[PDB]
């Protein structure tokens, strides 16, 4: 099947308007399998939240990490992270205007614009794999990245600093398009993005799908920002069961299931896109948020403080602050780990917590959290209602609602955590 055009992801799943994980169109895997992609024990599934990787079999634990996917380098797109721009699939002919445009980007501010230029050129380069793959990228109406939002959404975002950063991103992108897609460019550039919408879409995809790694291309150890057509279908998790790895002999990106972890049929195969970034950073770049984000922060200014070590032990949290994890030993999750990283806290070599003054601090910080919730016009479950029923699934608007809801739900978990901490301190 090394030909054909227009394979597509059946839009039966994005029909949630009246009110879940059907298989992706078999051609979506076939176009890879014909090109030496291999998926081992995993299946592409198509929810209304788009694609995901799910284990199609129970996978036994293994001593080394076990391969679950292999993607060959020929199907990837790459830009060098550092100034001397080179392309290792080398799609772009020498002296093509694309190189002049891509050079006119800031070396470190505009890597997304560079990747967007490559993505568009790879839609124009016939019989490049992304000529076929672009149909499976989310269109401009279904991409979650807030670069496609407008003030109608950002008013619902209710986060003026993040609204300002999104506005700056959009301004930067549109200014770059206006500067470099003016009427004087060759047709072999004007046809890449004849309107601003095509470019802002391409940038939003480049942002939401950019992996970055240190890699070895033969002898050259180098830093790449790259797009991998089946590792970018992995969904985020801060407790990932998989990680990406590079083989340089045959230039394969493996997706590896973690060593010593068993996984179950129908489990989502996920990766840790960027470790240690607050939810507002995931909204800034990727365009999503998660309530269990274990690095989120709260603008506390209280002199009330809680005994950190007792907060850990009451929730059986273990490890150093960079390491905090929870074990089998049940509401404790990434949001409680975020709480331990975020609450105004004190610690001492062995000194025990004052059982009274810690309850006083609990009450004070709980009323602080309550006034923080009171700074929003609505509760969490009102946004839950506004998501269990919704007018038109406007993806940017629903993403802003998910953001706000997640934050409130978080602060709620903070309240519940302090309550259960006091009760369980007995």
């Amino acid at each position: 099947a090394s030909l054909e055009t227009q394979p597509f992801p059946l839009f039966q799943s994005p029909a949630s308007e009246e009110s879940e994980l059907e298989s992706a169109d078999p051609d979506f895997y076939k176009i890879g399998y014909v090109r030496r992609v291999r998926a081992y024990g995993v299946e592409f599934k198509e929810g209304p939240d788009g694609f995901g990787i799910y284990a199609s079999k129970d996978i036994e634990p293994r001593r080394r990490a076990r391969v679950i996917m292999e993607i060959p380098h020929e199907l990837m797109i790459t830009i060098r992270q550092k100034h001397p721009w080179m392309f290792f699939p080398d799609i772009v002919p020498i002296g093509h205007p694309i190189f002049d445009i891509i050079n006119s980007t800031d070396p470190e501010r505009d890597w997304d614009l560079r990747l967007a230029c490559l993505l568009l050129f790879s839609f124009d380069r016939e019989d490049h794999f992304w000529r076929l793959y672009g149909d499976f990228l989310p269109a401009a109406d279904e991409c979650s990245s807030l670069l496609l939002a407008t003030e109608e959404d950002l008013a619902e975002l209710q986060d003026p600093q993040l609204v300002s950063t999104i506005r700056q991103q959009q301004k930067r992108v549109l200014e770059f398009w206006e500067k470099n897609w003016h009427s004087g460019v060759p047709l072999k550039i004007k046809r890449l993005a004849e309107d601003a919408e095509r470019f802002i879409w391409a940038v939003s995809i480049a942002q939401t799908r950019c992996i970055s790694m240190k890699t070895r291309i033969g002898a050259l150890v180098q830093d790449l920002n790259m797009m991998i057509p089946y590792a970018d279908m992995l969904n985020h998790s801060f407790e990932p069961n998989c990680f990406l790895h590079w083989r340089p002999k045959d230039r394969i990106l493996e997706v590896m299931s973690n060593a010593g972890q068993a996984i179950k049929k129908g489990e989502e195969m996920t990766i840790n896109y960027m470790p240690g970034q607050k939810n507002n950073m995931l909204m800034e770049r990727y365009g999503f948020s998660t309530p269990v984000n274990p690095w989120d922060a709260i603008p506390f200014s209280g002199d009330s403080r809680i005994h950190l070590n007792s907060f850990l032990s009451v929730f059986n949290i273990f490890g150093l602050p960079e390491e905090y994890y929870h074990d089998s030993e049940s509401f404790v999750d990434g949001a409680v780990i975020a709480a331990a990283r975020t609450l105004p806290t004190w610690s001492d070599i062995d000194l025990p917590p004052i059982p009274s003054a810690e309850r006083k601090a609990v009450k004070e910080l709980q009323d602080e959290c309550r006034k923080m919730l009171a700074e929003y016009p609505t509760t969490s479950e009102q946004d839950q209602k506004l998501l269990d029923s919704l007018s038109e699934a406007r993806t940017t608007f629903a993403t802003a609602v998910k953001y706000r809801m997640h934050r409130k739900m978080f602060i709620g978990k903070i309240i519940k955590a302090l309550d259960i901490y006091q009760e369980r301190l007995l």
Binding site: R62, R63, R64, V67, R247, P248, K249
Partner: protein, 65 residues
């Protein structure tokens, strides 16, 4: 028959052929130290190491194929 493709796969996996073969020799001698079953007939410790490692790669090969 097929086992050498697994060898090549593992040779392709490891970043140094000599370091890979050193690690196989180490694994075999620690196997024959941590277990003292004779394990020396129709199946051999080297093939066992290769089998277990390709099973870590996820591939359905039995012990000594």
């Amino acid at each position: 028959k097929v086992m050498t493709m697994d060898i090549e796969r593992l040779l392709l996996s490891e970043d140094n052929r000599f370091e890979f073969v050193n690690s196989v020799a180490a694994e075999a001698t620690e196997y024959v130290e941590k277990n003292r079953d004779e394990y020396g007939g129709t199946k051999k410790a080297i093939f066992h190491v290769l089998s277990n490692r390709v099973n870590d790669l996820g591939f359905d090969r039995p012990e000594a194929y």
